[PDB]
């Protein structure tokens, strides 16, 4: 994977000694080239993960996330061009360095071989985002935002470290290939429950899970837009990639202690989706929407069925493209109106034709029209959960109905209706943010044509 790693780190010298105006052009073009090179990673064998090196390996689960990160990186590059114009060149290059460093840690995380190496770069993503959230934020609270996001993830991260090093002393290795191949049943000894626990809350705190999610509304609604997408699109999914990994050994414990988190989640998305319907800030809805969508994933991983894992993977990638779009969409409105209140700028279809479309299928992908990959992930979860328990259907079915309730609500309360006559600064929609939405949406329908590439290794 150094055919991706080496060019990615080579973006640092190139972006750090380019001209004072070419930093945006240079970073965007070669990051896209990295995305094209990363597209070759879509190739997967029947069941053998691509073992490029001793310390790097990939399969049908890592690559779709890998392409998601690499494809994403130019998207914040173009999104940040708007509000980063009024800055010095050296600080601007510092911003680009954080994004590239964030990307580089992401690729190493997904391509990691053993759990400890995965853990190091996994957590290492906290540092670049911590600077992004805090240094370049917009409001006073961002200082409290960073601490909330940092400690929450760390509070669960440290128990996993103790459990991980404990794995090495007991099993003899932490390599994922050996762990799955040398998998042994886990006893129900009272120590083993905490052993199971210490490998879980690390992944579910950043999912986020119901209860342990408050950093999500306190960061995504408050981070800079560029940091907002990568947080929602991929960073939450870091728990997903880990959980499919760590569950290979933590069996058959999952049968019992999934329950306290299952209905914690099962009552979760319905509860969270209710909060989304009754927000006042724009970005607060999508943030609360993200945990709601992430909640069905938690059930998908934990239930441990092949169908749910495919549904987990599809919903994971689909939500990333979606949540990035709505966060980008909110940023476009926030920039002109200098706020994020929902009913502040209702009724803008008459002035924003193309935006009103970009609202339209972005919300529809949030409603998950058929046959968008959102349903393909969502429906697979439903069938797996129903096979587990019939009474499941009412809950998340009601959730995706209250999900439908709000997912038109901002469409009504941002585009439908009459403009505000005192507002007179909604200028012609610039092609930059405009083309940004195009690059968000077309891969969604393109992947809809051939979804078979994003169901993970269980397909």
């Amino acid at each position: 994977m150094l055919k991706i790693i080496i060019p990615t780190t080579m973006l640092l010298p190139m972006t750090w000694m380019s001209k004072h105006n070419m930093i945006w052009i240079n970073a965007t073009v070669h990051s896209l080239l990295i995305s094209l090179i990363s597209l070759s990673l879509l190739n997967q064998l029947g069941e053998n993960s691509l073992n490029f090196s001793l310390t790097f390996f990939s399969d049908s689960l890592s690559a779709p996330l890998l392409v998601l990160t690499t494809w994403l990186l130019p998207l914040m590059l173009m999104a940040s061009q708007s509000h980063l114009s009024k800055e010095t060149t050296t600080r601007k290059k510092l911003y680009i360095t954080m994004l590239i460093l964030l990307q580089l840690f992401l690729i190493m995380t997904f391509t990691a071989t053993e759990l400890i190496l995965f853990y190091i770069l996994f957590e290492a993503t906290l540092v670049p985002t911590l600077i992004i959230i805090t240094r370049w934020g917009n409001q006073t609270e961002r200082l409290n935002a960073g601490l909330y996001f940092l400690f929450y993830t760390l509070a669960g991260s440290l128990p996993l470290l103790v459990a991980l090093v404990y794995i090495q002393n007991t099993t003899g290795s932490l390599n994922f290939l050996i762990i799955h191949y040398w998998s042994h049943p886990l006893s129900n000894s009272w120590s083993n429950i905490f052993m199971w626990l210490a490998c879980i809350m690390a992944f579910m705190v950043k999912m986020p899970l119901y209860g342990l999610h408050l950093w999500l509304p306190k960061a995504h609604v408050e981070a800079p837009i560029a940091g907002s997408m990568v947080l929602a699109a991929v960073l939450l999914k870091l728990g997903g990639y880990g959980m499919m990994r760590i569950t290979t050994i933590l069996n058959p414990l999952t049968n019992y202690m999934a329950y306290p988190f299952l209905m914690l989640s099962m009552w979760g998305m319905i509860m969270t989706s209710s909060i989304c319907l009754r927000q006042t800030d724009l970005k607060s809805l999508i943030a609360y929407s993200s945990v709601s969508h992430m909640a069905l994933v938690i059930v998908a991983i934990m239930i441990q069925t092949p169908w749910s894992f495919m549904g987990a993977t599809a919903l994971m990638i689909a939500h990333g493209l979606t949540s990035s779009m709505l966060f980008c969409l909110a940023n476009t409105n926030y920039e002109r109106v200098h706020s994020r209140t929902m009913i502040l700028a209702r009724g803008l279809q008459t002035l924003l034709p193309l935006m009103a479309t970009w609202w339209l299928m972005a919300s529809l992908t949030n409603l998950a029209l058929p046959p968008s990959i959102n349903l393909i992930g969502e429906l697979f979860i439903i069938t797996a959960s129903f096979s587990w328990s019939n009474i499941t259907i009412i809950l998340m079915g009601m959730n995706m109905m209250i999900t439908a309730l709000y997912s038109l609500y901002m469409l009504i309360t941002t585009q439908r209706g009459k403009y505000t006559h005192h507002i007179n600064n909604i200028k012609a929609s610039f092609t930059r943010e405009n083309a940004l939405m195009a690059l968000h949406i077309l891969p969604l329908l393109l992947l809809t044509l051939n979804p078979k590439m994003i169901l993970g290794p269980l397909y």
């Binding site: 070759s40 190739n43 193309l354 929609s429 092609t431 405009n434 083309a435 195009a438």
Partner: protein, 63 residues
Amino acid sequence: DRRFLKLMRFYILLTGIPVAIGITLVNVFIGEAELADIPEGYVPEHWEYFKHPISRWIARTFY
């Protein structure tokens, strides 16, 4: 907004119709292959076990 839309189709069709022409040309100038019993004395190369020649070419040059 119209500047958007013609810029997409122009740039989409810039490499859109050439590869569209190339794929159609390949289908009607080289076609596909046919199943075999693996004639003895020669093991198939890595790109031999594929139907579409473009897929064979992709595996030939990259995989």
